[PDB]
């Protein structure tokens, strides 16, 4: 089919040149003896032209193209912004005996009956995770391969991470599929979004702090205000800890508080504001504000409570 050929060509064109061999080796759809026939010294365009011919000579379905897409995706995994789900269960419910095949079948069937045409793939990852790629369609349209959805589900745990691309239309359906396939009664969306899936994972599983205590110069210059400097240093160290901070890039606050400062004393309505913080490495810029003299010694708790509360978007009322 020409569609699968175009899909494979586009996916390969996305791949960087230096790491193309590792992706091809992991995919291993093409025979190993075929690989050395192609030469990677020449132009990228020539290499993709040859690879299309080799993969077309053999039978190539859409499933292996989807598998190549999953393999390419889990290498980069910072091209999308991720969101977190949390599932809950009843008090008297017993611990389940997870079975991969049953999970795959249930997640298949729910989508297959609710919609009509839909493609879902699986790639059982090491370290107890599952990668899923879903192409959305309905009774009267073929699946759209340009806009897939990726979800990472950690078995035996209540958490699943999903990519926000086109999931807005079919969010309740995917929620039902996830909560049925894994035998959970309810599901809610955690208000914590980021582009670093590993930082999200470390925060959500709260394993960013791994230190456990076990037993097994030019004297002419005089620095006044020295006690204040040492006190602010101590307060900053206590508040921000001593571990390496997880890497975020954004934080948002919504304010609905009254103005209290002669000026707007008679006003009885809140002052409506929305503010955002953006940085290449947030929580590291914030740590350095007080020693530099731009903030007071203890920062407000709204800023020092990101990883502990697993919160990224806030709302404040009077």
């Amino acid at each position: 089919d020409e569609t699968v050929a175009e899909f494979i060509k586009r996916t390969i064109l996305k791949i960087p040149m230096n790491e193309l061999t590792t992706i091809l080796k992991a995919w291993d759809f093409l025979s190993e003896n075929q690989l050395q026939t192609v030469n990677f010294r020449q132009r990228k365009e020539s290499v993709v032209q040859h690879l299309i011919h080799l993969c077309e000579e053999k039978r190539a379905s859409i499933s292996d193209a989807a598998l190549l897409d999953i393999i390419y995706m889990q290498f980069h995994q910072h091209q999308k912004v991720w969101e977190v789900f949390q599932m809950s269960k009843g008090p008297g419910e017993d611990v389940d005996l997870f079975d991969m095949k049953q999970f795959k079948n249930s997640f298949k069937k729910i989508l297959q009956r609710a919609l009509k045409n839909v493609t879902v793939s699986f790639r059982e990852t090491e370290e107890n995770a599952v990668w899923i790629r879903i192409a959305w369609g309905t009774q009267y349209t073929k699946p759209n391969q340009y806009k897939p959805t990726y979800v990472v589900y950690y078995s035996q745990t209540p958490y699943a991470f999903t990519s926000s691309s086109m999931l807005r239309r079919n969010t309740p359906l995917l929620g039902q599929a996830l909560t049925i396939a894994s035998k959970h009664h309810q599901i809610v969306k955690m208000d914590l979004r980021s582009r670093y899936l590993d930082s999200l994972k470390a925060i959500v599983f709260k394993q960013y702090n791994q230190t456990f205590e076990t037993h097994n110069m030019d004297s002419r210059i005089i620095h006044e205000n020295i006690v204040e400097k040492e006190r602010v240093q101590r307060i900053t160290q206590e508040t921000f800890g001593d571990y390496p901070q997880p890497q975020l890039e954004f934080a948002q606050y919504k304010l609905e508080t009254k103005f209290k400062s002669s000026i707007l004393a008679e006003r009885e309505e809140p002052l409506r504001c929305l503010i955002k913080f953006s940085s290449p490495h947030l929580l590291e810029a914030l740590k350095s504000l007080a020693p530099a003299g731009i903030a007071d010694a203890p920062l407000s708790p709204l800023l020092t409570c990101i990883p502990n509360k697993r919160m990224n978007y806030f709302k404040i009322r009077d």
Binding site: D191, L302, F314, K315, I316, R317
Partner: peptide, 6 residues
């Protein structure tokens, strides 16, 4: 109050 209801 951090409104957690949204």
């Amino acid at each position: 109050i951090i409104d957690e209801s949204d």
